[PDB]
Amino acid sequence: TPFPWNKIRLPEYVIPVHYDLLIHAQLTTLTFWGTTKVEITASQPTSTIILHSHHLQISRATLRKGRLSEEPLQVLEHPRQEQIALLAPEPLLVGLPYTVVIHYAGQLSETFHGFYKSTYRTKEGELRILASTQFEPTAARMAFPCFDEPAFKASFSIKIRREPRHLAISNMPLVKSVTVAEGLIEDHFDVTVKMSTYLVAFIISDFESVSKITKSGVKVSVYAVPDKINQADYALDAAVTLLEFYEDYFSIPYPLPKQDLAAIPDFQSGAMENWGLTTYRESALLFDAEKSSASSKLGITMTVAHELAHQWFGNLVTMEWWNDLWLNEGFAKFMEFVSVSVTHPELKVGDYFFGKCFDAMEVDALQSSHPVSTPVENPAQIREMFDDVSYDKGACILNMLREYLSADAFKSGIVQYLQKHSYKNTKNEDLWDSMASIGGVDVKTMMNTWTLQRGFPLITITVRGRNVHMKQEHYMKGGYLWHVPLTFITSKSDMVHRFLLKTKTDVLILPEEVEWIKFNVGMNGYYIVHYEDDGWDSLTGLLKGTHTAVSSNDRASLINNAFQLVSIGKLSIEKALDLSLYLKHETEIMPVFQGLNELIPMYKLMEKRDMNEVETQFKAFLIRLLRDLIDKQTWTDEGSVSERMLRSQLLLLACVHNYQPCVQRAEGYFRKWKESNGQLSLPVDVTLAVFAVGAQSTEGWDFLYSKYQFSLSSTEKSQIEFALCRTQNKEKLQWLLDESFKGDKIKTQEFPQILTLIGRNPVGYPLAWQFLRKNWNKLVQKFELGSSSIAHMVMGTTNQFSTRTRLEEVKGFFSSLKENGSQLRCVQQTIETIEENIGWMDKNFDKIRVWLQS
Ligand SMILES: O=C(CN1C(=O)CSc2ccc(Cl)cc21)NC1(C(=O)O)CCCCC1
Ligand SMILES: [Zn+2]
């Protein structure tokens, strides 16, 4: 019998309203069984129900009407479309309720998606097995058969059968636990509100918990393994504050009685926003006040803010289809900064936002970047939407739109959009309609330019007395027109002046002549700026003579833009390097980090070429440039989060480049720490430098690795992994890859990061690209084609190559995969990146060699 449906998308005429899911997982055999009952209605007469199912063995399917009548359903499967077809003996009557009942079995996934196995070892040595879920985007169909597309919203009543030794949690509160046959307990959770299948969640584990109630009465809890629940308090307090913030900000209460935050021992992404049961990597939630870094504290706060923003932007209101995933992700990413700027003002997170926009511009400058909203169909293409364009470009265009409309008008537009579309699905046009309903400024033409075209513009400024000429063109490495909300300040006015450039060119007249003008104030706009004539000389002079004339983020924007303009031949590498010399007097984290972001990649290219002399001189130039700031750092955990992050990065950079004052200090801490058998608490902020130096000897590497198995600190485990990956012993590098790939000694959730760190090691970088090619199939099976993890592995191991032989290795390898990876967007991105690295190094290597000598 041929399969009666030939489309990836399900039919539109059979709609679910409610699911009753009974799941029994047997954690000793890793088998699970389920009974799914789905209440549906048909709007057309049909005798066939198509729905999703992947890797489930269906034993029986029946159609109930009512007066109960049952009819057996015949089951057909189309595994490539991940669909099943259920055939009824007579047509369903239009508009009447029916209930499809499906009994099935499956095996817990050994990946990080679907209903999957997670393990950990107690401090006492016992291996413990738990089961958890990760469904977004298309894996709910691996746990229960369903209409697995986000616009088929429905309510869900979940029942879990489990051994008495385990705890089960799910989206909603536990309302009853009933003893059933064969020594099991069946937990019944309350019915969810109407929501997408990808948000269903359930966990069977040994977790402990802590809780706190919001002012609105919502019970917030953190769940973690017993040995780590003592690290839950920071996240619990942050979650209560952030949930209260969003309820007030949006004027829409959180609608469930409780919100859980569960730290899972094995987790692929950072976290997931399942309604009522948000999940996290342990590193993204758990804070050890003695060993966690300042960056970790900031990251937990932002991750909790992101998952809680999604309760409104993603859960309450959901994109209709994955082409518009940015409506969920760009908003959640932007709301991290809107919220944490108010809830945790000590973190000064608004100061860091622009860096996310420069992350998006790296990808979006390439010829094959995709528009923010773009068509996708199959699961791998949908997973590719979880990328820096949806998250970071999405947040950056919303920031630009909020600055343009004003925070109050943008907030009113948010609130109207969330209220109007509550418990429903949206597309881009709904957001523009809401934003314009405030009848306010129409946003559709402008925002279509930022969502339906790839890339961003270069704005060129030419000043002739009071006349300021503006032009826009597409910025691309290797037709476009936007509505660009420009901003500028000048030597005579630090008010933010606004000008909307909707055309190829325009002109404005300053009230009086100025000494300099600086566009894109605060880097709040998604564009870059070039200045003709003496413009770059004037801004270089401003940075050299009176750098505080513009904000720290404005100085970071000039550093980034100057180097981006070298790439397209608008500014010479010598002039961009001359501008970077001002950094000898820079004190602030954002412009220092932007200088590292532009200069460090240049030596990473040199490390993989026959360029020892220039590589050495370039690294010496970088340390000389920042030497005074490096020397001023204390070897402590003092200061604000920015002061701490700046210290840690600078000491690590200095030690990696063998700056003897820092190496000697790091060697002394490592020796004292090792001689004390690790008793001695080191300042967290110097730990990366200390461990990186210590792991350079065989005794130090072995000692550091010996402490890894006992650590309960996600920061300490991360710092040890980083340091071990800096070894120049290739047998130890291969061991790190083999062992993290296997997941026993080092968990596989760390393998993507370890592979990129080894891909960036100056001696062992070939091993990482080699490992990726040899183990590709298993890596795809574990992490999935199209995943952000596979994208980071492909870029991480290849995007610092700069020869035509390496470019052909990448093209030849990936083209040979055919359906198993040749068409990945990350592969085209890394090819275009290597093509740019080849051209940039051919054009600029000798110029840099001469500049360093002069
Ligand atoms: O270079 C890298 C990693 N890395 C890149 O690979 C190119 S993108 C990048 C941007 C900024 C910074 Cl701080 C590092 C970057 N890390 C160090 C190194 O030399 O490998 C140098 C810093 C100390 C830690 C080591
Ligand atoms: Zn998100």
Domains of the chain, by residue range, sit at 1-206, 208-454, 456-560, 730-844
Let me know if 307 is a catalytic residue: yes
Distance 568 CA to ligand 1 centre (A): 24
**Of 621, 620, 533, 613, nearest to 581 (Cα)?**
621
Amino acid type, 502: K
d(CA 844, CA 580): 16
Distances (CA, A) of 85 to 10, 51, 553: 11, 7, 56
In terms of Cβ atoms closer than 10 Å to its own Cβ (0-12, 13-18, 19+), residue 852 is middle
Distance 305 CA to ligand 2 centre (A): 10
Q: Nearest residue CA, atom 7 of ligand 1?
A: 601
CATH topology for 456-560?
Immunoglobulin-like (2.60.40)
Output phi, psi for 118, to 5 deg.
-130, 150
Output phi, psi for 436, to 5 deg.
-80, -20
Contact call for residues 324 and 373 (beta carbons, < 8 A)? yes
Q: Which residues are annotated as a binding site for Zn(2+)?
A: 306, 310, 329
Header resolution in angstroms:
1.3
Q: Considering every ligand atom, which ligand is closest to the CA of 648?
A: 1
DSSP string of 675-699, one letter each residue: HTTT-SPPPHHHHHHHHHHHTTSHH
Output phi, psi for 182, to 5 deg.
60, 40
d(CA 581, CA 628): 13
Q: Which residues of 499-529 are buried (b: 16+ CB within 10 A; e: fewer)?
A: eebeeeebeeebeeebebbbbbbbbbbbbbb
Distances (CA, A) of 200 to 148, 152, 422, 444, 589: 11, 13, 18, 34, 41
Name 541's Cβ contacts closer than 8 Å, sequence gap at least 6.
none
**Peptide-bond breaks in the chain following residues (C–N over 2.5 A):** 66, 438, 478
Distance 321 CA to ligand 2 centre (A): 15
Distances (CA, A) of 399 to 393, 449, 557, 633: 10, 15, 16, 34
d(CA 733, CA 133): 32
Contact call for residues 155 and 275 (beta carbons, < 8 A)? no
| Residues shown for the chain | 854
Amino acid type, 785: L
Q: Nearest residue CA, atom 24 of ligand 1?
A: 653
Contact call for residues 418 and 250 (beta carbons, < 8 A)? yes
d(CA 828, CA 368): 7
Three-state DSSP at 642 gives: helix
Name residue, tokens 């002109």: 507
Q: In what order do the strands lie in the sheet with 497-501?
A: 497-501, 484-490, 517-519
CA gyration radius, the chain? 28
Q: Considering every ligand atom, which ligand is closest to the CA of 387?
A: 2
Name 164's Cβ contacts closer than 8 Å, sequence gap at least 6.
183, 184, 185
Beta strand spans in 13-68 (E): 14-26, 31-42, 48-52, 57-65
> Which is the closest atom of ligand 1 to the Cα of 657?
19
| Ligand 1 pocket at CB < 6 A | 596-597, 600-601, 604, 649, 652-653, 656, 760
d(CA 28, CA 117): 11
Three-state DSSP at 25 gives: strand
- In DSSP terms, 530 is beta-bridged to 460
The DSSP call for residue 727 is -
d(CA 482, CA 503): 7
Contact call for residues 132 and 279 (beta carbons, < 8 A)? yes
Name 274's Cβ contacts closer than 8 Å, sequence gap at least 6.
133, 135, 171, 199, 200, 201
Contact call for residues 73 and 61 (beta carbons, < 8 A)? yes
CA quadruple 653, 658, 660, 664: dihedral sign: positive
Are domains 1-206 and 456-560 of this chain identical in fold? yes
Tokens of 522: 């605060």
Distance 352 CA to ligand 2 centre (A): 18
Three-state DSSP at 764 gives: coil
Return the number of other C-beta atoms located less than 10 Å from residue 730's C-beta.
14
Return the number of other C-beta atoms located less than 10 Å from residue 111's C-beta.
18
Name 50's Cβ contacts closer than 8 Å, sequence gap at least 6.
4, 5, 10, 11, 14, 83, 84, 85, 86
d(CA 779, CA 759): 16
Amino acid type, 533: D
Q: Of the CATH numbers 3.40.50.300, 3.30.70.890, 2.60.40.1730, 1.20.58.340, which one belongs to the domain with range 1-206?
A: 2.60.40.1730
> Which is the closest atom of ligand 1 to the Cα of 653?
23
In terms of Cβ atoms closer than 10 Å to its own Cβ (0-12, 13-18, 19+), residue 600 is middle
Element (H, E) at 404: helix 394-405
DSSP string of 356-385, one letter each residue: HHHHHHHHHTSTT---SS----SHHHHHHT
Contact call for residues 831 and 798 (beta carbons, < 8 A)? no
Beta strand spans in 367-493 (E): 424-426, 456-464, 467-475, 484-490
Amino acid type, 694: G
**Could you say which architecture CATH assigns to the domain 208-454?**
Orthogonal Bundle (1.10)
Contact call for residues 296 and 283 (beta carbons, < 8 A)? yes
Cis upstream peptide for 137 (omega within 30°): yes
d(CA 338, CA 319): 21
**Of 116, 101, 92, 94, nearest to 51 (Cα)?**
101
Three-state DSSP at 456 gives: strand
Q: Which of 82, 307, 667, 784 is catalytic?
A: 307
Distance 243 CA to ligand 2 centre (A): 16
* Phi-psi region at 125: left, alpha or beta (left = phi > 0; alpha = psi -120 to 50): left
d(CA 493, CA 488): 9
In terms of Cβ atoms closer than 10 Å to its own Cβ (0-12, 13-18, 19+), residue 346 is exposed
Longest dimension (CA), the chain: 93
Q: Nearest residue CA, atom 6 of ligand 1?
A: 760
Element (H, E) at 655: helix 641-656
Three-state DSSP at 284 gives: helix
Element (H, E) at 176: strand 174-180
**Of 444, 375, 330, 333, nearest to 8 (Cα)?**
375
Name residue, tokens 């000039």: 558
Mutating to test ligand 1, I would choose from 580, 593, 603, 604 the residue with most ligand atoms within 8 A of its C-beta, which is 604
- In DSSP terms, 74 is beta-bridged to 87
Distances (CA, A) of 590 to 249, 352, 599: 29, 7, 14
Q: In what order do the strands lie in the sheet with 57-65?
A: 69-72, 57-65, 98-107, 31-42, 14-26, 155-162, 184-189, 174-180
d(CA 630, CA 6): 63
**Of 670, 646, 654, nearest to 622 (Cα)?**
654
Name 47's Cβ contacts closer than 8 Å, sequence gap at least 6.
87, 88, 89, 90, 91, 92
Element (H, E) at 73: none
Q: Nearest residue CA, atom 21 of ligand 1?
A: 653
Q: Which residues are annotated as a binding site?
A: 136, 270-274, 306, 310, 329
The DSSP call for residue 147 is -
End-to-end CA distance of the chain: 78
Q: Considering every ligand atom, which ligand is closest to the CA of 592?
A: 1
**Helix locations, 288-325, DSSP H:** 294-309
**Of 775, 848, 836, 851, nearest to 800 (Cα)?**
836
Reported as half-sphere exposure (CB side, CA atoms, 13 A), residue 680 has a value of 15
**Of 642, 654, 736, 735, nearest to 688 (Cα)?**
654
